[model samples]
Target: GREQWASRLGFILAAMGSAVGLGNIWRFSYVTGENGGAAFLLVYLGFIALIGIPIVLAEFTIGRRAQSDAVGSFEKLAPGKPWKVAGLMGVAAGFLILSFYGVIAGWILFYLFNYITGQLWSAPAEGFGGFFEGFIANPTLPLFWQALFMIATIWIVAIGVKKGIERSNKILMPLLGVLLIALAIYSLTLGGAKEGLAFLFSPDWSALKDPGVYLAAISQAFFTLSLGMGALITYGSYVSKDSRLPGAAVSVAGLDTAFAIIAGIMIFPAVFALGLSPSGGPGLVFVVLPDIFDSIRLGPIVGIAFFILLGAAALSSAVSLLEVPVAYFMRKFDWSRKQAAITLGVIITLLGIPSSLSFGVLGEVTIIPGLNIFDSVDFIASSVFLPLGGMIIALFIGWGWKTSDALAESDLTDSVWGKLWILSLRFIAPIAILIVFLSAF
Candidate 1:
């Protein structure tokens, strides 16, 4: 009676679509560059294998076994237990995440529209750097774009699973991958290939001494893989019982990681070749990429195509974030999918207004001493909610659920991998996350 994916590949692609997001492009490249490049990547991969993948499988196992939304899944599975709190965190995480996520999506859409209108065709006399700042700082226009982005997200999700989510991902994921690879190849030819490659691949051993690098690596692993936020659990609910989750979990993690590394390759070379800083922070893609697009022949076409791919990537991830809340409200209130989609989507878009304005008028309203509306929300979600949510999930399956039930549902019961997964979830992951959280204080 519930919605189900039409095929196994559809489910996998949809899951992959959820895992890969703006992090794979903007956050991943910048973090890797700042944390000593290849060395930090190795640390990140280690965290993914040990921390990210295990919790991902745990979330998937819980969803498929319960066949319900994030909060409802816990209610169905372990009724009366505080295990439900983990699911509550997930619902909250999804809400908090999509709030700011829509704002970022609007930024991407604005860029895409700008490219289509040939705005990035020539370098601005004020320079790309100043141009990006002024545009985002305009105060009114970014909110309009943000609202439009949220509307598009609501439309796709209101259509339901098979037609809305599965159908869209089947095309977008493959197209995004192909375009990313092509962009990377073109980036290398910009005459900064060797230096860029070295910046990304060569490690500064001294970085291993910094405590912040480890924290950044763990957070990036959680963020990039879409772990700890309950989106995977929501996506996993639609999976058929016959589906194997272990393989699906591994596939999503692998594909998501690969996407980040390739994006790093795509971006750094162009930045280096153009004599721009690799550690350009969040503005790397906004400013540097446009400059790269302007210097080459057919640059406008390439810029337009690049933003198209980026908007699709943002949409795919945004849909998953919205789905987490939509599914929960649908089950809790017994509303139809359309009802849940529109109501919650509108609420999230409205919540995102301050974030959209954080770059402009609201920039002075710092919630914390240094962070603005957009950044405060991001920090709380990323540094606080996500890790805490993930730690609870690992504890839930590792201690709350019987070992046999976790393994059986996860399809790892037949092998020693089950023992290892349980160990990782129970002992390794909880302790590691605790360390990261403590380090932040």
Candidate 2:
């Protein structure tokens, strides 16, 4: 056995590692750049400080006190209560996330190969859209990469705890940090660095008035940091009770948000410098950056390094997603790590095939009249489970469980901040989420 978290510090680091991933880097940058840039981030920060922190602490306390997977935690501790539903929802959400997430992870892996083969350095004229459209439409390419990503996740989890999660984070977290810094440096030297910086820094307060902006802010804060859902709860179950959780929360959120801002820096500079549109929609990273790489001096090597790093971030998130369901199986069925990992790996790999084929065979697989693969994911995660998860967790914790003892469990307890947090959880988050829930119609 690799051993369960070597110490509390290890658990904290590993938990934070699970939370910070590709969303913060790729997705966050594009959204912020397109909408409010710095203004959007400012809104996000306020939410993170206020709404996000409290919810994070709530999940943390639930997991630590229960000392079990989200499902088992409540079932074992609060036998008569309804908190168990939150735990189960976490399990369900993790699996749902896996279906689409595996495909995105596959895309990252696909690009990693492009980086390696010097294809990434090829020009915008070579057709980034054609490359993406053709790649997704093709059956063999995406599936092959997705299978590779799943196999990697399965192998790591099968190796058990310490080496698999801890060691990987120890190496990859630092590597992720260093490489992001490298990319940030590259952005600094790019011709539009000032323009990029200005766009990210300039804030129009009027933009905050838009209801769509608020929804985006709340959703981004929750999902990008991997909060609200059972993923955080599951990760928290392994935490060392004595570790500095307050500190850990800050570090994770800070790094997660920093990577996003740095990504904006990395992206906008290159896009604007190369005379491409800064706001390239959902395909910004894949569709736009290849063009910049095409025009650059040493596009091949730089493009390869960038995609490899991006692949690392994407895989890190995917592995955590894989772990949640496997954790559920291990906790509930008394299965061995190897058995659980394989069981999940096989199922999710099969599920991912449709997702992989969506760009080709399932062409125009529309959920609503207009949505595609990516938009459908946003609708499901945002409109369905994310807000619902938060609302359910709040109701469970605030009313279903003992508030006094649980309040003491968090750093914010007794402080004005904690009081405000509870108010938000009980009133604000649920209301906010419910409105979005309705708006999804």
Candidate 3:
């Protein structure tokens, strides 16, 4: 028998835990900085409402109705129909995403340990940029950290649903929320808080003219929400029938968005305060923030707190990613959960080796034009696989399944809001995703 979430709160926390992660902090801050801040945020929020939430509901509905893993859900529901491709894409995406995601999470773990050891209390003689460069390029150390991180993820998943995934989220998500708010408040008291607030809230209207902003926003929405990859579906499958799906879906989306915004509040103020450019790209957190911390009064202590927050958030998200494939293999191949988690976890870690090496030994190898092994993998999953899976899911719920049946499963019960959700799935969401898809080429 499949395990169910121990409580309604546990399920919501697990879902939120899946949603809130490195994407909210590391990716969101840098991407917002690069895409012109407030204008980019506006488009992101629009996409979240029109596209993100509806698909979230759709995934929940599908999973709860079938009461199965991502691949198993489709196999059980439509039974050999083409819609199963979406579920398969989701399983593939889980593998692809966690492979690179583990690499980055390893970096976070590496930084967290350094802070705990006071190794980063002062700026390195080589400077933060060189310090970061040297670490990722080391090859061996990164793989060790990646293996350690993957082991942590596997350990949680191996414990099974209620005891492993739900219990961890129940503790970590609340702590993450509290730490995030405290940091944002402290960061706002910095010297550059006024300017940072302006940069984040006051839009440069002209930026809306750039087509790239829309694509970036939609991609961020999908990535941050853990959507289109069956993470939510797998999580939803554990939910009890009496739990309200739409409420949980909306709460997860809302909390995830708030986490990203608050992370911006925390990061941008410190960046501007230190006179660092907001458009520091991927290095905004790993490189730039450490430098900011090094210059501050209680730098090491703050760094310790910040990196702890990052590591904890990454672990929660990684658990969800690992669970998707683990759950699939457990059901499909009849592998025990422990066996599946350990086996798949090792494979995903091995897959991440090249991504970790791309910073140094494999830097010259480009799978896509101008993208290294790491970035190419990310592009294929985040930019291509995730969005395509999302579109397919939207179409599946809107067209493949009976509308009334989906409504009942989601507990929306043909109300106005439910109809709006169906309409968004059928027309608005898919059309917008297709436009973003074509725009990519």
User: What is residue 403's positional error in candidate 1, in angstroms?
Assistant: 1.6
Residue 438 error, candidate 2, Å: 4.6
lDDT of 2 by residue, 361-435 (tens): 876788756876656666566546665676777766676656676667665567776677678677776776677
Worst 10 residues of 3 by lDDT: 168-177
Scored against the true structure, residue 55 in model 3 reaches a CA lDDT of: 96
Per-residue accuracy of model 1 over 1-441 as CA lDDT, tens digit each: 888888677888888888887889987888787787877888898999998999999999988889898888888899888888888877887888899888777888888998888787888889999999998889788889988988889999999899888888466667778988988998889899999999888877788877778878887887888877889888888888888899989999999988888898899898888888778776678888888788778989888887787888889899999999999888788989999999999999888888878888887999867889877887777777788889999999999988789989999997888989999999999998898778756
On lDDT, the stronger of 1 and 3 is 3
Measured by lDDT, the strongest candidate is: 3
Among all windows of 10 consecutive residues in model 2, the one with the lowest summed lDDT is 1-10
TM-score of each: 0.96, 0.89, 0.96
Candidate 3: residue pairs that collide: none
**Candidate 1, pairs of clashing residues:** none
Where does model 2 exceed 4 Å of error? 1-3, 33-36, 122-125, 193-195, 204-209, 294-296, 411-424, 435-441
Angstrom error of the Cα, residue 205, model 1: value is: 3.0
Q: Summing lDDT over every window of 10 consecutive residues in candidate 1, give the lowest-scoring window.
A: 167-176
